[PDB]
Every structure is written in structure tokens, then in C-alpha cells.
Design a protein around this nucleic acid. Structure first.
Lengths: 745, 87
DNA sequence: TGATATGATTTCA
DNA sequence: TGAAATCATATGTGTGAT
RNA sequence: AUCACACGUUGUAGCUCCCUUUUUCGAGAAAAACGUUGUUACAAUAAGAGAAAUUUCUCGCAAAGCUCUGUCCCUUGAAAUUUCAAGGGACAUCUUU
């Protein structure tokens, strides 16, 4: 019937266990029904240790910065074309900038220096800024450009910064003064194309910067709250700020004005009110602010006007008679309000006195399956993913066996939140007020060790099932056989199968960030400059100029041998070749037969992540067609398979004589049968060169393959290669059968 | 309807945004993107005064830009939605 | 500070 | 003489406000 | 979460150091191509999509999910082993975005 059981579960950074356990009327656990492990990703960047979303955040910030830089460059080009200046700009714009101070600057030169000013704006970093500003207070250095041509490229020889070294950084105001002085001299030097309107537009372009909006875009729209059905009240009104203040005897009403922010001494900041106070006391308008302090309604209309209108005329018309001319003019110079509270102005009027003296709103105006873990309340990503996989396992177990009786947590602000969520959001079939019971695994695991199963945790994922099986005490041979053995039926319900989370996402990094050259790609090699700081013997033997120019190669050999191959110490001093030139980076060849044509085809970068591989068969053979994220983005379905000793130019192409078997995403179950040995595992990766698949054992046993992965196992002579699939509980293992090659978009 | 500086907040409601969610993917995303962008550029059109790096005359010019361009961004989203079945 | 793509180099049928 | 394992090897970064 | 700055890398171009090749003048250099040190500027800085209309906006390395669309499984039933009805899932190329 509807079996009563204890769920149990064992949270983890990258693995959530579970163990269904039999119980009875007395709630003493019995022989477990079946167990399993749900392994997933670490939910963090494995190298850095930061959050997975942080890389996407930095990449999106870089994309936006590049887009806005090229956008402002296009606006500058539009302005220069409108003034008929742009109509291949000179590259010596620093010397041309210095020449702009004395003697008129020609059309193309002036355009080049103005566009350089637009692209490079300015403002470690601060130390260099202050140093350049202090050195800018001298008669000789009339401008940063003059500081760069007469002082930077004499002692250093390079104007722009290099490998950090922010001593050459300038200021936004310094370059603004450069542009102003250049316009002044050019008008003095009879330059027709130096209009003041151009100066104003270019100064606006140089100084414009998108505000740090942050927040949530949902809150910034004007709702209606459906209660009074008029509109939504502004967040920065007096009533709304009082709303969040009253909720968070009569002596406490004045207290928010008694101090700008509250602390432990007398324990929420009334930010808008104190902001208006500071703006009003900024001028000598103390007399008018005294009356505004008492009135709450006037502050309410000020808040609505500033958080609902943004143009000067709008607030001027909305608050014509409610405020005097000077107080209004001073109000519209430092105030900036946004966002809305969840209630309305009339609703706030009704509810504030009664809250002071949801209940006020009331008096004036599923369970079977655990719901989704709230993503907004939980901020840490790894616990979010762990709770997500935990609830997926919970839903699967409830679906398979019915509603549980009690749910216990072994942990492995987190356990408490999960306990509260399960207690207050899931039906459950317990007895009493102990529906959910988390506990510490240390004492429990010691008591379990008295039963003799300790010192068992290994890198294999089946050990994590013990943390969930221990739910019985918060026998040894039975659980040992059920979990560790791969065939409990022939030894003493089902073997434990680690159900790794299917990573069938079709998006990710298109290519590696290090971009190399594709000019000589048809030889299967790429040429990229690398600094002498990290140039070893092998990269020196891979130098492009080995036989072209011998003298540098031999001296580099001697210098590397002199300092015993340490590249940082060997070339910490400026290397001098024949002719007096300095050497910091040199082109070094690298074997690149596979990659992505990037930078509008100019460069090439290595592939970053395989999203899918299309398994095929052709006359008793087996073929693998790798699909990458950049191919998905480009809408390309490849038909060239992985073949050894040949490059992608000549690969055995799947034709009508080749029958599609299945498409493989990472972490999908596969069965491989060959003469040597058959094995069931998860597809982890395809080697594009050797054509082999690095299928990994489901539990990542260390005795099987390299640290768990059967690397380099081939399929070209496989008797049968089939794709398997499994539920999130490691149950119902079966043979899959795709019918059509689904496109990659 | 016709979006102006004053009535910007009366069309750019959350109700219209939640009513724009039933469009097909190829149309909903370009329209919801022009909707949020118009709100973001408009909701912070006075932030140019919170910083002392911009003069009042200069921050006035950036306020006109952050309003006139955000109204245009909202008009296109509504116009496209009117061309669609959302109207 | 680590998964991931993949290339050279052997070992096997 | 191809197919399969094996072992190596590189992989974007630092600064300052909101 | 958000906005900028400084690099770095790739392509191009200028100057610049050393240089392989083809010749010419006649050891040494003028010319041509390629490699390439340093330096500056420009273009790009994911691969790319969606909707309008020389250009604009949004999305584009993450998480969650079933409101919509899909590839399959699990149950159930109607019609000639097949097409379909309904419900429940795993996922996503689908939604928050």
C-alpha cells in the first residue's frame, strides 16, 4: 500500500544522497527499501573557487563596456562627420596632441587626436593618477599629452601602460582640460573646425557614464497594488519609509530623525528623509526646512514627484504651489529617487496609524510535493544548487513510493532553512511537531562507527550514500552489500547507481580567451606572442625565427643557460639584441590544428567546451561527430567525424551510407561493448585527435581508469555502442532509441 | 499610446510588462528588452546629480538624454506590441 | 588555484 | 598500419566606484 | 548585481631592430616578398541570434523552474503493431531573462 518511510538526505557541495528506510507504527527504522546518490557539479569555479555566475558577470560587464565604448566612438564619428571633419587616421596622435598646443592642427590629425581622447578617457592606478596630476602642475608639462611625449617616451620609451605599471594613467578631468585647451588654441590658431557646440558635445561624450542602476527592474515600474486600484506608492515617500520603519512608547516616532542611521547604541535608516535634510541644509535655506519637517504629506508628494517624474519641468509643474521657488530649485539639484513600495498612498494612509498602534490591511480592506526552493532568499550559489538537487530527489522519491513520514538532514543557515521549508511547505505523514529533524553527523557517525563501517569514505561517490543511510539512528552487512556491491541480487533490490546530473546545456564558452594567429593555420600551427617572463626552453625551440634570424636565438639560449632557464630572472633586465632594440615578447609557434576562427576570422582560439557529440555508424564502424558551443551559436550541424592522423580538412564525412545512432551530451549514460571489456558509464569527453571517448565510471572508482575515468577507450571496433539513460534516483536503467538527429540551436 | 516625458510612468507599468509575456520568443524578447531598457534609463535619469563630477549644466544635458532616449525606447516596445496581438 | 580540449607518443590487433 | 590507450600541456589580468 | 579605467591578445598600417629568399647596381647597398624586435593608432575582444530599419535596442559563458514549445519515458484509453486522448516526470534548443 502507501508505504510509510523516512526520507533522509545528505547535503553536499557536489553530491546529495538519499536513502528510503522502512518504518512502523513505533517509528523505529527497519531494512531500507533502496538508496542512491545524485552527484552534480561543484557549483563553483574549480580553479578560482568563486561563483559560477561571477565569470558570466565579468564577461557581460566586458561586453557592455566594449559595446558602449564603440557606441561612443560611433557617436563621435557621427559628430565629426556632421561638422564635415571626418568626411585611416594618423597614428602619431600623442605628438599631434602636443603639436595642437602650438601651431594649427590639420583636419585628419585633429580628428585622430579627438577620437583618441574619446576612446581613452582615464580616471597602483590612483598612485599613478596622483603622480601625473602633481607632475602636471609645472610650466613645462602643460598637458598630459606633453607629459607623455617629453617625459614618458624618454626614460621609458613607451607612452601607454604595459603589464600593469599604472604610472602612466591620466585623469578624466586632465583630458577634459586637454580638449578645452586644444580647442582654445585651435580657435586662436584659426582652425575652422573647432566650433564650441562640437566642444560641448565632445565634453558630454567624454564625461557621460551610465548610472549604477543595479537593483531589480521589476520594482522600478509603477504598479497599482489592486487594493485601492489607483496607482502604486513611491518607495521614497515619507509614508512608504514609515511603512518599512513601523513594521521594523511614542518616543520612537521621532527617533529616526534623532540620528542619520541607527546602530547598536539605540537598537533601519530613513534614507530619503535624511537625504532631503542634507540637501536642504546644504544651502542657507534652514528657515523653509523647519516647516517641511513637520508636514508628512508634503514629503509624500515630494517623494511621489521625484520617484515618478524625472524631467525638471515635470516636477516643477507637479509641485508648483506646494513649495516655494528657492526650496524647489535647491531640491532639483541633488535629489534622485526611484523604486516603489508594495502598497499605495491611500492604503498607506489607512494602515500606518493602525500598524503604529498585513493585519492592518486585513482589518481595513502544493503540499504533496515539495515546491521549488526560493532562489531570491538564498544567495549563496552552492547551497542553492544543493537544495535544488535535494528537492528534485525528494520529488522523485515521493512520486515513486508516496508521501514520506519524516525527513531528516545530516547537513554534511542551511540545514535550518531546509528544515523550515520542508516543515512549512510539504505535506508529509509524520506524527507530532517533529516533521523535520536535522542533526549533527559527528556523534551519529561515531555511534554508527561502533557498528563498524568507519574509514570507508573514498573519492568514489557511493560513500556519500552512507551519510543518508545513517538516518536510521538519527545491519552493517546489509547496507554494505546494498551500497558498495554492484550486484546485491546475486550476492544476497537493485545496485546503487550514481545518477550524475545531466549537463545537457547547449550554451557556454565559445572558445578560449587566448587568441592566436590564423594566418598560417593550414600548416596546423598558430603563432602567438608570449612574454620573456615565462618563456622556457621548449617554447624557445618552438620559436618562429629559429632559422630566419639565428643571432637572437643563440643569445637567448646563452642567457637562459646563464640564469638556469628561469625566464623571469634571465630577462628581468632589458634584453639587447643587435641594433639596440629591446625584447620583451617574441612570436612562438604552437601546434593548432583545431579551434575557432574568431575576431571576424582574423585570429583563432581553441575550443572551450563540447556541448554534444553525434555518434554514427558506417559499415560496421562507429563514428563521433563533436559539436561545440560555437557551432551551436553559428547554427552549424557538423558531419565530419573524429579520425586519427588526419586534420579536420580531410575527415571521414557521414553520408547517406552512415546511419545516425544517437546524440550524446556530457554526463549521459552509455554502454560500450568490445572484445576487451564491456562497461557502463557516463560520457565525459571526446578527444578530437585520437577519436577516443573518456567515459567515466558512474561512481568514479579509483581502481577503474585514471582516478575514475576510462580515458582513451575507443569505439571504432566496438561490437555495440548504445546510449543509456536513468532517473534522478539511479533507477530504471534502460536502452534509449532516438529517431531523428535533432538540430543544435 | 503616445509616450511623453510626463506620462512615461503610466504606460510603463508592471501590468503591461506581465501582459507582454504571452508573445512568441522571437518577438517577446526584443520588446521586453526595449521595455526594461527604457525603464532603466528613465528610473535613473536624476542620478547624474548624485555625483559631484558633473556640473549642474552638464548633468542637465545628461538628464535630457536619459529622458528623451528612454521615452523613445518605450515607444518602440509599445508600438511593436500594438503591431502584435498584445494591443 | 582545477576541469577541459587535445596533441605527441607509445602499444596493440 | 590504423586503433587504442598514455602522458603531457596550456588555460586572460589588475584597479576604482556605485 | 552595476558603471568605468589600465592593460593584454589577434588583424591591419606607419616608423623601427635583426634578418631568410629573388634579382639588380656592383666587398657594400638600391628594389620585391615573407619572418619579425620595440612603439603608436585603428578594428575586434566570445563564437553569434531576435526585432525593426548603415544604423539602433535587447539577449549571448550562470542558476532555477514546467506557465508555453520540443526529445524521450511511465501509466491509461479510443480508432486502422500504427495515429491519437489525458495525466505524471527527466531534461532542455523553452520560461524567469
Amino acid at each position: 500500500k502507501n508505504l510509510n518511510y523516512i526520507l533522509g538526505l545528505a547535503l553536499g557541495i557536489a553530491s546529495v544522497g538519499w536513502a528510503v528506510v522502512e518504518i512502523d507504527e513505533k517509528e523505529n527504522p527497519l531494512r531500507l527499501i533502496d538508496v542512491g546518490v545524485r552527484t552534480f557539479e561543484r557549483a563553483e569555479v574549480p580553479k578560482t573557487g568563486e561563483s559560477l555566475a561571477l565569470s558570466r558577470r565579468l564577461a557581460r560587464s566586458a561586453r557592455r563596456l566594449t559595446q558602449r565604448r564603440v557606441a561612443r566612438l560611433k557617436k563621435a564619428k557621427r559628430l565629426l562627420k556632421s561638422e564635415n571633419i571626418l568626411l585611416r587616421l594618423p597614428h602619431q596622435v600623442w605628438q599631434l596632441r602636443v603639436e595642437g598646443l602650438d601651431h594649427k592642427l590639420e583636419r585628419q590629425e585633429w580628428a585622430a587626436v579627438l577620437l583618441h581622447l574619446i576612446k581613452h578617457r582615464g580616471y597602483a592606478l590612483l598612485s599613478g593618477v596622483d603622480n601625473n596630476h602633481k607632475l602636471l602642475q609645472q610650466a613645462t608639462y602643460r598637458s598630459p599629452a606633453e607629459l607623455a611625449v617629453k617625459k614618458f617616451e624618454v626614460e621609458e620609451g613607451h607612452i601607454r601602460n604595459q603589464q600593469g605599471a599604472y604610472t602612466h594613467t591620466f585623469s578624466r578631468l586632465d583630458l577634459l582640460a586637454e580638449m578645452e585647451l586644444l580647442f582654445s588654441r585651435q580657435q586662436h590658431f584659426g582652425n575652422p573646425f573647432a566650433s564650441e557646440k562640437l566642444l560641448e558635445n565632445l565634453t558630454a561624450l567624454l564625461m557621460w557614464q551610465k548610472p549604477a542602476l543595479s537593483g531589480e527592474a521589476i520594482l522600478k515600474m509603477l504598479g497599482k497594488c489592486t487594493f485601492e486600484d489607483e496607482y502604486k506608492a513611491a518607495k521614497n515617500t515619507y509614508s512608504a519609509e514609515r511603512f518599512v520603519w513601523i513594521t521594523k512608547r511614542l518616543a520612537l516616532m521621532e527617533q529616526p530623525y534623532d540620528k542619520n542611521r541607527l546602530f547598536y547604541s539605540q537598537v533601519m535608516e530613513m534614507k530619503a528623509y535624511h537625504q532631503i535634510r542634507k540637501v536642504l541644509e546644504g544651502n542657507n535655506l534652514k528657515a523653509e526646512w523647519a516647516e517641511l519637517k513637520a508636514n508628512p504629506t508634503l514629503l509624500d508628494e515630494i517623494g511621489t514627484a521625484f520617484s515618478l517624474y524625472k524631467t525638471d519641468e515635470d516636477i516643477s509643474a507637479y509641485l508648483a504651489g506646494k513649495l516655494s521657488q528657492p526650496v524647489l530649485n535647491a531640491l532639483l539639484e541633488n535629489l534622485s529617487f526611484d523604486k516603489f513600495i508594495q502598497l499605495s498612498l491611500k492604503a498607506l494612509y489607512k494602515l500606518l496609524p493602525l500598524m503604529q498602534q498585513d493585519e492592518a490591511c486585513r482589518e481595513i480592506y502544493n503540499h504533496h510535493f515539495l515546491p521549488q526552493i526560493p532562489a531570491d532568499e538564498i544567495r549563496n550559489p552552492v547551497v542553492l544548487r544543493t537544495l535544488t538537487q535535494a528537492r528534485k530527489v525528494i520529488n522523485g522519491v515521493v512520486r515513486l513510493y508516496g508521501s514520506p513520514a519524516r525527513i531528516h538532514i545530516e547537513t554534511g543557515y542551511v540545514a535550518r532553512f531546509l528544515c523550515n521549508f520542508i516543515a512549512d511547505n510539504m505535506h508529509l505523514t509524520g506524527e507530532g511537531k517533529r516533521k523535520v529533524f536535522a542533526s549533527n553527523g559527528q556523534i551519529t557517525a561515531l555511534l554508527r562507527s561502533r557498528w563498524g563501517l568507519a574509514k570507508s569514505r573514498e573519492d568514489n561517490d557511493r560513500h556519500h550514500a552512507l551519510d543518508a543511510v545513517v538516518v536510521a539512528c538519527s545491519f552493517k552487512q546489509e547496507v554494505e552489500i546494498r551500497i558498495f556491491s554492484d550486484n546485491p541480487k546475486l550476492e544476497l533490490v537493485q545496485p546503487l547507481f550514481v545518477s550524475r546530473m545531466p549537463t545537457r546545456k547547449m550554451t557556454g564558452q565559445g572558445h578560449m580567451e587566448t587568441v592566436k594567429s590564423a594566418k598560417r593555420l593550414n600548416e596546423g600551427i598558430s603563432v602567438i606572442k608570449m612574454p620573456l617572463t615565462k618563456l622556457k626552453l621548449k617554447d624557445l625551440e618552438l620559436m618562429v625565427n629559429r632559422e630566419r634570424e639565428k643571432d637572437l636565438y643563440d643569445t637567448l639560449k646563452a642567457r637562459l643557460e646563464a640564469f638556469n632557464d628561469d625566464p623571469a630572472k634571465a630577462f628581468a633586465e632589458p634584453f639587447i639584441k643587435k641594433g639596440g632594440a629591446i625584447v620583451k615578447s617574441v612570436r612562438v609557434e604552437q601546434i593548432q590544428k583545431s579551434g575557432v576562427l574568431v575576431r571576424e576570422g582574423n585570429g583563432v582560439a581553441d575550443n572551450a567546451s563540447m556541448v554534444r557529440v553525434d555518434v554514427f555508424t558506417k559499415g560496421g564502424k562507429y563514428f563521433l561527430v563533436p559539436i561545440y558551443t560555437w557551432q551551436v551559436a553559428k547554427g552549424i550541424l557538423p558531419n565530419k567525424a573524429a579520425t586519427q592522423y588526419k586534420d579536420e580538412e580531410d575527415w571521414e564525412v557521414m553520408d547517406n551510407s552512415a546511419t545516425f545512432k544517437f546524440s550524446l551530451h556530457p554526463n549521459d549514460l552509455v554502454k560500450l561493448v568490445t572484445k576487451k571489456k564491456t562497461i557502463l558509464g557516463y560520457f565525459n569527453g571526446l578527444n578530437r585527435a585520437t577519436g577516443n571517448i573518456d567515459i567515466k565510471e558512474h561512481d568514479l572508482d579509483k581502481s577503474k581508469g585514471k582516478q575514475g575515468i576510462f580515458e582513451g577507450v575507443g569505439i571504432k571496433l566496438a561490437l555495440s555502442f548504445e546510449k543509456y539513460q536513468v532517473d534522478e534516483l539511479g533507477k530504471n536503467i534502460r536502452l534509449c532509441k532516438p529517431s531523428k538527429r535533432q538540430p543544435v540551436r | 499610446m503616445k509616450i511623453t516625458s510626463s506620462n512615461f510612468a503610466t504606460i510603463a507599468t508592471s501590468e503591461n510588462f506581465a501582459k507582454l509575456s504571452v508573445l512568441p520568443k522571437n518577438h517577446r524578447e526584443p520588446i521586453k528588452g526595449l521595455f526594461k531598457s527604457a525603464v532603466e534609463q528613465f528610473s535613473s535619469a536624476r542620478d547624474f546629480f548624485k555625483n559631484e563630477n558633473y556640473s549642474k549644466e552638464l548633468a542637465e544635458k545628461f538628464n535630457k538624454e536619459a529622458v528623451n532616449e528612454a521615452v523613445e525606447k518605450l515607444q518602440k516596445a509599445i508600438d511593436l506590441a500594438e503591431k502584435q496581438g498584445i494591443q
